[PDB]
Every structure is written in structure tokens, then in C-alpha cells.
């Protein structure tokens, strides 16, 4: 009774890979499938050792290890389109390392992933990332503001938004995040009432709020 015979009728739904530690790794595509497999192993239908894995869990695990041994490495995401040969995207600007160091890093990653034959490291451009983000928000016609910091870019989408706008935004952001991850660019989406709650005011360095006719309030520059 092979393991593939136990996972189901839809043979193409799962992928079995042998690992150097003498263990079978069942790669899955989503949570629902992950739990469909884990139930089979946890029930004990199979009798040797086996494990279930997916891209999100592995990205978390590897990030946690990097936090300890390479606490200043600037990177984006690890892609597992080909689970036998992952691709790791590093920033070209914000990292200074030699070719030798990169090779060492590669070998240590290979030690963390006993199902992978090698890890390919690719250098990506920050300007490219930022440009795709701003082009996406323009193409979708959302109102936004951009803030720049040394380590990152932030886009603030806030105010009174219509249903159509909210839907477009959610779809786009979900698409972007799956490519670039959430380390360099952050999108803040916040529904605001009217800033001042239907009250007249004067803006600028001498601004003030009219609480009511005959009643002035001086909170701040506006």
C-alpha cells in the first residue's frame, strides 16, 4: 500500500518527494488540501514516517531561522513553483555580500530543506517593486498617498470608499502580496468618516473649529 494510493482518487492533487532524512514529504497547495492529507497521516493509515508541507508554512519557518543567524539580511520571498529547486529573491541594493558568502548561505538553506536539491539565489530591484505597486494603484484608480522611508515604502488608502473600490483594492493587494510578500511594501486600508464630523472649520496655521455659531475651539494647526 503506497502512500499515493491513500491520498485519494485525484492523483494530481498532491506531490510526493523523497528526502535525505529518509522521509516522505507531501507537498500541498492550500490549507484545505493540507488538512486532507494530515488527517490521513494522523489517523495512522501509513506506517513509516511522512510529513505534509506547503509554501506559507515553509516561508514562516525559514524566516524564523534567518532572524537568528542573519538578522540583517534584506530579502523578499522564496518561491516553490518547482519544489525541487526553490528560488530565493534578495535585494540588490540593501545587501552587501560576496559571492562566497552567497554560496555559504545557499548551502545552509540546502541543509534546512532536505527535499530540495539546490537553492537558486536571484537579485531583484527595489525600484521595480515600488514601480509595480504604484502602477497597480493608478491602474485601479484608487486614491492614495505614498510615504518613503529608508527601509520601505508605505501606501495609505483611506477615507470614504465605495463598495466597488473596496472590492478592487482587496483583489489587487491580494495579488501583489503573493508575488512580493509583505516585507518591503505595506498597504494601509482605513475607512474614515468625514474628518471633522460635519463642522465648519478654518484650515492652515491659524486654523480652528466652529463647535457652533458663537463657539470657537482651538485644538491644533489644521
Amino acid at each position: 500500500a503506497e502512500l499515493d494510493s491513500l491520498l485519494g482518487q485525484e492523483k494530481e492533487r498532491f506531490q510526493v518527494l523523497p528526502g535525505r532524512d529518509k522521509m516522505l514529504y507531501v507537498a500541498a497547495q492550500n490549507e484545505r488540501d493540507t488538512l486532507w492529507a494530515r488527517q490521513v497521516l494522523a489517523r495512522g493509515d501509513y506506517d513509516k514516517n511522512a510529513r505534509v508541507i506547503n509554501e506559507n508554512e515553509e516561508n514562516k519557518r525559514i524566516s524564523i531561522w534567518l532572524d537568528t543567524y542573519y538578522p540583517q539580511l534584506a530579502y523578499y520571498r522564496i518561491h516553490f513553483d518547482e519544489p525541487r529547486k526553490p528560488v530565493f529573491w534578495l535585494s540588490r541594493q540593501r545587501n552587501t555580500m560576496s559571492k562566497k558568502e552567497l554560496e555559504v548561505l545557499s548551502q545552509k538553506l540546502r541543509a534546512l530543506m532536505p527535499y530540495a536539491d539546490s537553492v537558486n539565489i536571484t537579485l531583484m530591484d527595489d525600484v521595480t517593486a515600488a514601480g509595480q505597486a504604484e502602477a497597480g494603484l493608478k491602474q485601479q484608480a484608487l486614491p492614495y498617498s505614498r510615504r518613503n522611508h529608508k527601509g520601505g515604502v508605505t501606501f495609505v488608502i483611506q477615507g470614504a470608499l465605495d463598495d466597488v473600490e473596496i472590492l478592487r483594492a482587496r483583489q489587487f493587494v491580494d495579488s501583489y502580496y503573493r508575488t512580493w510578500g509583505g516585507r518591503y511594501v505595506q498597504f494601509a486600508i482605513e475607512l474614515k468618516d468625514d474628518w471633522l464630523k460635519g463642522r465648519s472649520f478654518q484650515y492652515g496655521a491659524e486654523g480652528y473649529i466652529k463647535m457652533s455659531p458663537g463657539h470657537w475651539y482651538f485644538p491644533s494647526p489644521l
Binding site: 465648519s200 472649520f201 478654518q202 484650515y203 492652515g204 491659524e206
Partner: peptide
């Protein structure tokens, strides 16, 4: 209103509007 200085009226009586204009 990122720049300068102005007034955001909400069905305000002209007395309160031109009073706000008085400083300029």
C-alpha cells in the same frame, strides 16, 4: 487643503462666513 488658508462652510450664515474672512 495642504496649502494656504481657507474656510470650509456648511450652510453657514453669511455673518459667520465674512467674520472668518475678516482676518485676511
Amino acid at each position: 487643503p495642504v496649502t494656504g488658508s481657507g474656510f470650509v462652510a456648511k450652510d453657514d450664515s453669511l455673518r459667520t462666513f465674512f467674520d472668518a474672512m475678516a482676518l485676511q
